[PDB]
Amino acid sequence: CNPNLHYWTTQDEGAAIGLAWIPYFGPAAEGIYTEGIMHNQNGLICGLRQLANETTQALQLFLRATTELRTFSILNRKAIDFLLQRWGGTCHILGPDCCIEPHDWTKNITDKIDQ
Amino acid sequence: CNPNLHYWTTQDEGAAIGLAWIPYFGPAAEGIYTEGIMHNQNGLICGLRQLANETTQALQLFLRATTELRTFSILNRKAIDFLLQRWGGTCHILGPDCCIEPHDWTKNITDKIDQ
Amino acid sequence: CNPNLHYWTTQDEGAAIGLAWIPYFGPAAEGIYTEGIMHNQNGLICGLRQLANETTQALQLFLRATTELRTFSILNRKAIDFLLQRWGGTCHILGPDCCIEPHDWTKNITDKIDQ
Amino acid sequence: QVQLVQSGAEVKKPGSSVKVSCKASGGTFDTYAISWVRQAPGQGLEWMGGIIPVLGIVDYAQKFQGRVTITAAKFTNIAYMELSSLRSEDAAVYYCARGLRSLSPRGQEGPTPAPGWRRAQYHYYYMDVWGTGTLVTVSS
Amino acid sequence: QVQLVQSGAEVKKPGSSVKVSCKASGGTFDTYAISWVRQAPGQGLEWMGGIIPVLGIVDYAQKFQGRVTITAAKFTNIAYMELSSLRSEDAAVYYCARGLRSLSPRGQEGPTPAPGWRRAQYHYYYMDVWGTGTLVTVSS
Amino acid sequence: EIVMTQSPGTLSLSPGERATLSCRASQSVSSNYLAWYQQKPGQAPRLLIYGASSRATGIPDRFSGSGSGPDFTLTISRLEPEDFAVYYCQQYGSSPGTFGGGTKVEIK
Amino acid sequence: EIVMTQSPGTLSLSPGERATLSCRASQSVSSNYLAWYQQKPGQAPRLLIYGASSRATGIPDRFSGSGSGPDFTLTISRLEPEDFAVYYCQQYGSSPGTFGGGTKVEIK
Amino acid sequence: IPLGVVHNNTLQVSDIDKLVCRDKLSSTSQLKSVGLNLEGNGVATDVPTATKRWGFRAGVPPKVVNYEAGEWAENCYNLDIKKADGSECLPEAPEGVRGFPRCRYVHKVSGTGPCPEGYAFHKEGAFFLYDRLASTIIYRSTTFSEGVVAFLILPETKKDFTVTLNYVADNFGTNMTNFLFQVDHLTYVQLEPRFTPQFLVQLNETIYTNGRLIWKVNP
Amino acid sequence: IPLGVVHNNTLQVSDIDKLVCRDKLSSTSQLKSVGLNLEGNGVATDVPTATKRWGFRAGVPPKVVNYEAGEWAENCYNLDIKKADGSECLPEAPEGVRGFPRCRYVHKVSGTGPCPEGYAFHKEGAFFLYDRLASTIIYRSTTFSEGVVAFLILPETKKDFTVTLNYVADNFGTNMTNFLFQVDHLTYVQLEPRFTPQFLVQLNETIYTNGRLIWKVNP
Amino acid sequence: IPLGVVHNNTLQVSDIDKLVCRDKLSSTSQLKSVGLNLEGNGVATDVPTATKRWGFRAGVPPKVVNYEAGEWAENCYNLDIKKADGSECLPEAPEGVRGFPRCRYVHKVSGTGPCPEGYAFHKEGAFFLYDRLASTIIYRSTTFSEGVVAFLILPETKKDFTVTLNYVAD
Ligand SMILES: *[C@@H]1O[C@H](CO)[C@@H](O[C@@H]2O[C@H](CO)[C@@H](O[C@@H]3O[C@H](CO[C@H]4O[C@H](CO)[C@@H](O)[C@H](O)[C@@H]4O)[C@@H](O)[C@H](O[C@H]4O[C@H](CO)[C@@H](O)[C@H](O)[C@@H]4O)[C@@H]3O)[C@H](O)[C@H]2NC(C)=O)[C@H](O)[C@H]1NC(C)=O
Ligand SMILES: *[C@@H]1O[C@H](CO)[C@@H](O[C@@H]2O[C@H](CO)[C@@H](O[C@@H]3O[C@H](CO[C@H]4O[C@H](CO)[C@@H](O)[C@H](O)[C@@H]4O)[C@@H](O)[C@H](O[C@H]4O[C@H](CO)[C@@H](O)[C@H](O)[C@@H]4O)[C@@H]3O)[C@H](O)[C@H]2NC(C)=O)[C@H](O)[C@H]1NC(C)=O
Ligand SMILES: *[C@@H]1O[C@H](CO)[C@@H](O[C@@H]2O[C@H](CO)[C@@H](O[C@@H]3O[C@H](CO[C@H]4O[C@H](CO)[C@@H](O)[C@H](O)[C@@H]4O)[C@@H](O)[C@H](O[C@H]4O[C@H](CO)[C@@H](O)[C@H](O)[C@@H]4O)[C@@H]3O)[C@H](O)[C@H]2NC(C)=O)[C@H](O)[C@H]1NC(C)=O
Ligand SMILES: *[C@@H]1O[C@H](CO)[C@@H](O[C@@H]2O[C@H](CO)[C@@H](O)[C@H](O)[C@H]2NC(C)=O)[C@H](O)[C@H]1NC(C)=O
Ligand SMILES: *[C@@H]1O[C@H](CO)[C@@H](O[C@@H]2O[C@H](CO)[C@@H](O)[C@H](O)[C@H]2NC(C)=O)[C@H](O)[C@H]1NC(C)=O
Ligand SMILES: *[C@@H]1O[C@H](CO)[C@@H](O)[C@H](O)[C@H]1NC(C)=O
Ligand SMILES: *[C@@H]1O[C@H](CO)[C@@H](O)[C@H](O)[C@H]1NC(C)=O
C-alpha cells in the first residue's frame, strides 16, 4: 500500500473568515478547501483504506434499504446510535453498559459516611 | 377489523449478503423485501391500526406545519426526543424521572458504610 | 432600532383542529399561522436581531461548507450537539460535566447508614 | 361555436371502401358521440353508429352491420366512417352530428341479458350539433 | 451590424389609417428608442415620437397629436407608426431610426415643473442607424 | 332499429300562416324524447325541438312542439319563407333511435 | 416644436472642392448637441457629426463640424460624388429635437 | 406524534408526555415507520368507492413521508387520469417515488373528466402508500394502496415484524360516475360496486369464453 | 452557530463549547429557527436601496435553510426581472417554495437590464425570506422579505412566541436605476427615495383622481 | 455500518454492538465521512481497467451519500458518453453535483456505443467520488475519483485532517 498521503478537506474552520463569508465574496468553488501531506504514521491510512472498503459494503447494503436519495443524516444517525447505545433507557450505575463514572463518587460518599 | 395480518418488511439485514451487496448485482428493487403472516396476538394487529389512524391525523397536522417535502427525519428526531424526555440535559439523582438504577450502587455504598 | 416585535408563528399545536386536519379541507397554506405583538421586554427584541445577524454569518459559512441544499436537519443536529456537549457518551459527576445533581443524595446516603 | 365539417364530394366505384370524414373545426371529438346519417336521394336520414374517439363502446347501426366501421383516434378532431362494399344505393349526402355530448355509461341502454348470455348496451342522445354534408356518388 | 428595414411604397386613400412597419433586421427593438420621420416631398425630416417596445412611456410629436400611435410589442423586432386620418400632407417617405438604444434618464427631458401641475419627460439621441424608407402616396 | 313515419308529408302554406306537422313512432317514446329538426334541400339540418315540445338553442318562439306516447306534433306560428323546409323527426327516448322520412313544407 | 433653418440652401460645387455648410437654430443648443447628416435622393440619411463637431462612427476626416449656441457649421474637404447630398441638421440639445429644411450640394 | 411501543408482545401506546423508563431504545434499528392498508378496518376497496374517496384541491403544498415496513394489500390502485382533451390530471411521480409492489389486485384506472385544478387527494386524509413512501397525493401511473401510518419502538428481538384490472372512468366523481371494467377494446363489463376483483376475473373468463361491446352481470 | 436561550424572558446565548447545566431541553419542540427582517435594525427599505444592496456572481451554488417563525414585513419584494431581450434574469424557485404571505406592502418590480450572469445575492449576506424558508438567492416572481435567521431554545411555557406596489426598473444598478412607480400602464411617477409605500399609495390615488405619461411629485 | 476510531494515532474499529466507555464524542464535529481513492491500495488506474470497472444495469434506484474530506486523487475520470445513435447515454448530474475538486489527471472520455439500458456503475461497488458527494452512478461531463467511503471518530486535536487527457470510447 501507499504510506505517503496527499489529502484535502473542507474549509469548515469556524473563525477563519472575515467579510468573505458572503456567498459571492469568496471563491465558492476551488478556494474553499484546505490540504496537506502526511506520512502514514503507524500504518493508519492503509488501515483506513481497508475500513473504507468494508464500510462501503455495509453502507450500500444500508442505502439499498432506504428511499432517501442524498443523505448526510447518516452520520448524525451514527451520533444518535452512539447516544442510544450508551444510554437507551435507564442508567445502570455499576453496569458496564451506562459508562458512567461513579467511581470518584467515593470521595464524596466516603466523606459523608465518615461523619 | 382484520385480525389476520399479512405483512412485509425490508431486507435491511447485513449478514445475509456476501458479494451481492453491490446494488447492480441483484434485484435491487423488488426482490429486497420479506413477508409473512401473523395472528392478532394480544390484540396487537387491530390495536396498531387504531394507533395508525390517530397518528395520521396528528401527522398531517405536523406535516402542514413544515416545509420539507420528504420526511426521513422522524425516526432520528424522535430518538433525540426520547433521550431528551428521559434526560433533557438535566438530572436529579433522587428524581424518579432520571431513569437511574442505583440498586447495586446501594450495595457498593453499604459495603463502604460497613467498613 | 425598533424595540417592538410584530411576529407570526406556525399553528403547530396538537388537537386544535377538528375535521379540517385534512390538508385539502382547509387553507393548508396561508391561514395556518398565528400572530401577535410584544414589547421589548428586557431588551430581547433588538438583542435577538443582533443574534440572528451573528448567526447568519456562522450559518452561511456552514452552508458554503456543505453539499446539502436544504439543510432542514440542522436544528436536529444542533439537538445532537446539545446532548453530546452535555454527555458525549461518557458521564462524569464530580465535575459539572454530565450535569447530574447528587447533592441531595446526601439524604439517601444518610438513610442507608441508618438502615 | 364549433362547426362540424365534412370533406367534399367524391365519386366512388361499387365494392370500394369509402372513408367518410368529419372535422370538429372549433372543438374536438374526444369524449362525445358523433352520430352519422346517410341522406340518399329521395330519402330521410338513415342512421349510423356514434363514434367516440376516447371510447368505451362506440355503436354500429343494425342496417350497417358488416358495412360501416365507426372509428376515431383518441383525443382527435377527425371522426371517420368506413363504408365497405359500397353500392349505388349508398350514394348520399353524409352528415356528422354530436348526438350526446358526453358518452358516459348513462348513455348505455339495450335489451336485457338472458341467464348464460348477455346483450350489450348503447344509447345516443340529441344531435344538437350538425355539420356540413359530403356527397358520395356511387357508380354501378 | 444591424440594418433597419422599412416596408416598401404603398398607395392609400385619405381618411385611412396606415400602420407603417419597420424590422430591426440584425437586432431587436426591445428597450431602444426608435425615432421616425416623415419626408414629405419638398420638405426636410418631420419628426415623430420614439417607440419603445418594452415601454414605460413612448414619445409623441405635437403635429401628430391625435394622428399617430407610437407602438411595438414587448421584446419584438417590429416597430409601428399608426397614421390615422390620412391626408395628402402625409404623402411622404417614412423612415425608422435608432437613436438612444437604451431609454434611460438622459432620455427623459421636458418642460420644467409648475407646482400643482406635472410634465412628462422623454428624449432621444443621435440617430446612428437609419432604415430604408416607405413612400406612402396619399390620394386627394 | 325503430320504425317511424311522418304526415301529411306535404304542407302547402302561405308565409305567415300557422300549421301543424305530425310524426308517429311505432313505439311510445320514453320521456317524450322526440326531436324535430329542419333543412331546406341542399342544407344541413338544424335541431328545432327536443323533448317533444322544448325549444332547442337559438330557436324562435314560432316553433312549439307537443305530444306524448308515440304521437307528436310541431306547430309553427307565422311560418317564414326561411322555414319552408323539410321537417324531420327523430326518436331519442329509445335505442337505437330512429329517423322518419320527412314532411315537406312548401310555399302555396 | 423648435424652429431650425439651413443655408445657403444650395451649393454648386466641383468635385474635390472644399465647402462650408451652415445651420441655425432658433434657440441655443444645450451641450452643442447638433447633428449633421446627409442623404442623396433614394438613400436613408447617415449621421456625420454629433455634438457640433465630433465625427460619427465610420465617418472620414473630410467631415469636420464646428459651432456654438444656435450657430453651427460643417466643413467638407475634397468633396466626392458620393457627398453631393442634401445635408440636414438636427437638434438633440433640447426636446423634442428638431430638424432643419436641408442644404443641397450639387455638381457644377 | 404518539409512539407505540411493543413490550412483552403487547402493543402499548406511550403518550409522549408520559415517561416510561423501562423502555429501552439502544438503536435507531428499533425504530420503524409502518404503512397500513384501509382494508384492515373492514371498509370497501372497490373502484366506485375509491373514486368517492378521491377529490381535488389546489393551494396545498405536497407532502411525502417515508416508511420501512407495512401491510400487504388485497387491493391497490394505479391511476392515469386525464382530462377530456387528453391533458394530465395528476402530477408526475417525483424522483424516488415508485409504485407499491405488494398488491394481490391492482385497480388500474384511466378515462377522462374535468379534474378541477388541484392535486388529487384522499377524502379522509388516508395516505397513499407507495413503495416505502407515503403521501397525501396521487401520482400518475403509480401504484398505491390507501392507508394510515404508525411509528413504533420495537423490542430487541428477532421477530422481523399479480392481477391487473383495468377500468374506464366517467368524470371522476362529478355526482354521477359509472365505470366500465375493460378486458379489451371490444370487451367490457358494466361495473357494479357489490362485486369483488375475483368476481371480475370470473366474469372476464365467462365473457372470454362466450365470444369476447359492454355487458351486464344479470344475477 | 450559537444558540439563543430564553430564560425568564431574558436572552442568554449558549456557545457550542460552553456547558450550561441550567439549559433544560425536554424535547425538540423547544427548538426554533426564527426569521427576522432587516427593518427593525433601522435600515432603508425602499426599492433603490434593495437594488443597491443586491449583486451577482456565477459559480456560487444555492443554499437553503428553513424556519418556523418570524417577523412580519413592512416591505417585501416580488421580482420578475428580465434581460433586455426578455430572457429571465432570476432563477426559478424550486418546488415547495412559496412567496412570503406576511407583508403589508409588496414591491413588485419588473423592467429590464443587463443582469450579469450569476445568481442574485445580498451584499452583506442577508437571507431572502420566502414562506418559511430562508435562502441566499433571489428567485423569480416570488415574494420575499429580507433578513437574518436565529436559532434558540425556548422554556416550557405557554407564550406562543395586501398592497402591491408595481415599479419598473432601469438597468438594475448600472451607475443609475431610475425607477418609476406605476400608477397605471400609461401613468408613471418618478420614484424618489424618501417616498414610502404609504406615500406611493397616496400619489397613485391622487393622480388617478385627477385624470392619470410621466409625472413627478413636485413636493 | 462500522465506525473507525482514531486513538492517539492508532486505529480501532467500533462495531455497533461494541461498547467502549472510553470513547467520548463531545461534538458531531469529531465525526467525518471520508472519501478514499482506489489508488493507495495498489490497484491499476489505467484506461482499460477503469473501463472494465464500469458497466450497466437498469432497475437499480440511484444512491448518494455525502462526504466531508478525502484523499487527493492522482487519477480521476470524466465521462461524456453518447449512444450509438448520437443521443446522450449518461444521466445528467443532479443539482448540487460538481466533479471532484482535487485531481492530478483527469481521464476525460467521450465517444459512443450501444448504451445498455441502465446506469453506468462500478463493478466492485466502489463509489464515484464527486465534489463532496459519493454515488453509485457515473454522470455526464462530471469528474470523479474512484473510491470508497469510511466513517470515523477523530480526537479533539488540531491536525487539520489540472492535466486533462482526452479519450474516445468504442
Ligand atoms: C379513522 O376511523 C374513523 C372511524 O372511527 C373513520 O371516520 C369515519 O369513517 C366512516 C366510514 O366507516 C365515514 O362514513 C362515510 O363517509 C363517506 C364520505 O363522506 C364525505 O363527504 C360528505 C359530503 O358529501 C361529508 O358530509 C362527510 O363528512 C365526508 O367528508 C360517505 O359517503 C358515506 O356515506 C355512504 O355510505 C354509508 C355506508 O357506509 C351509507 O349508509 C350512506 O347512506 C351513504 O351511501 C359514510 O358517511 C365517515 O365520514 C368518517 N369520518 C367521520 C368524522 O365520521 C376515519 O375515516 C378513519 N381514518 C382514515 C384515514 O380513514
Ligand atoms: C450585521 O450588523 C453589522 C453592523 O454591526 C452590519 O455591518 C455594517 O453595516 C453598515 C450600515 O449600518 C455598512 O455601512 C454602509 O456600507 C455600504 C456598502 O459599502 C460596500 O459596498 C460599496 C458598493 O459596492 C463599496 O463602494 C464599499 O467600498 C463597500 O465595499 C456603503 O455604501 C455605505 O455608505 C453610504 O451610506 C452611508 C449611510 O449609511 C453614508 O454616510 C455614506 O456617505 C454613503 O453614501 C455605508 O458605509 C457597513 O459596510 C457594514 N459592514 C461592516 C464591516 O461594517 C451588517 O451589514 C449586518 N448584517 C446583516 C446580514 O444584516
Ligand atoms: C475490497 O478489497 C477486495 C480484496 O480484498 C476486492 O475484492 C476482489 O479483488 C480481486 C482482486 O483485485 C478481484 O478479482 C479480479 O476480477 C477481475 C474482473 O473479472 C470479472 O469478469 C470475469 C469474467 O471475465 C468474472 O469471472 C469475474 O467474476 C468478474 O465479474 C479479473 O479480470 C481479475 O483477473 C486478473 O487478476 C487475477 C489476480 O487478482 C489473476 O489471477 C488473473 O489471471 C488476471 O490477471 C481478478 O480476478 C475481485 O473481482 C474483487 N471482488 C469484487 C466483488 O469485485 C474488492 O474489489 C475491494 N472493493 C472496493 C470497493 O475497493
Ligand atoms: C381474461 O381471461 C383471459 C384468459 O385467461 C386472459 O388472457 C390470457 O392472459 C395470460 C396472461 O395472464 C396470457 O398468457 C394468455 O395468452 C391470454 N390468453 C388470451 C388473450 O386468450 C385475460 O388477460 C383476462 N383479463 C382481463 C381483465 O384483461
Ligand atoms: C391606484 O388607484 C386605482 C384606482 O382606484 C386602484 O385600482 C382599483 O383597485 C380596486 C381593489 O382595491 C378594484 O376593485 C378597482 O376596480 C381598481 N380600479 C381600477 C381603475 O383599476 C389601484 O389598486 C391603486 N394602486 C396602488 C395604491 O398601488
Ligand atoms: C351535485 O348535486 C348538487 C345538489 O345536491 C348540485 O348543486 C351540484 O351542482 C351537482 N354537481 C354535479 C357535478 O352535478
Ligand atoms: C460607473 O462609474 C465609474 C467611474 O466612477 C466607471 O469606471 C464605470 O465604468 C461606470 N459603470 C457603468 C455601468 O456605467
From TrEMBL, chains A, B, C:
<protein>
    <recommendedName>
        <fullName>Envelope glycoprotein</fullName>
    </recommendedName>
</protein>
<feature type="domain" description="Envelope glycoprotein GP2-like HR1-HR2">
    <location>
        <begin position="5"/>
        <end position="85"/>
    </location>
</feature>
<comment type="similarity">
    <text>Belongs to the filoviruses glycoprotein family.</text>
</comment>
<feature type="glycosylation site" description="N-linked (GlcNAc...) asparagine">
    <location>
        <position position="108"/>
    </location>
</feature>
<comment type="subunit">
    <text>Interacts with host entry receptor NPC1.</text>
</comment>
<comment type="function">
    <text>Functions as a decoy for anti-GP1,2 antibodies thereby contributing to viral immune evasion. Interacts and activates host macrophages and dendritic cells inducing up-regulation of cytokine transcription. This effect is mediated throught activation of host TLR4.</text>
</comment>
<comment type="subunit">
    <text>GP1 and GP2delta are part of GP1,2delta soluble complexes released by ectodomain shedding.</text>
</comment>
<comment type="function">
    <text>Acts as a class I viral fusion protein. Under the current model, the protein has at least 3 conformational states: pre-fusion native state, pre-hairpin intermediate state, and post-fusion hairpin state. During viral and target cell membrane fusion, the coiled coil regions (heptad repeats) assume a trimer-of-hairpins structure, positioning the fusion peptide in close proximity to the C-terminal region of the ectodomain. The formation of this structure appears to drive apposition and subsequent fusion of viral and target cell membranes.</text>
</comment>
<feature type="disulfide bond">
    <location>
        <begin position="1"/>
        <end position="46"/>
    </location>
</feature>
<feature type="disulfide bond">
    <location>
        <begin position="91"/>
        <end position="98"/>
    </location>
</feature>
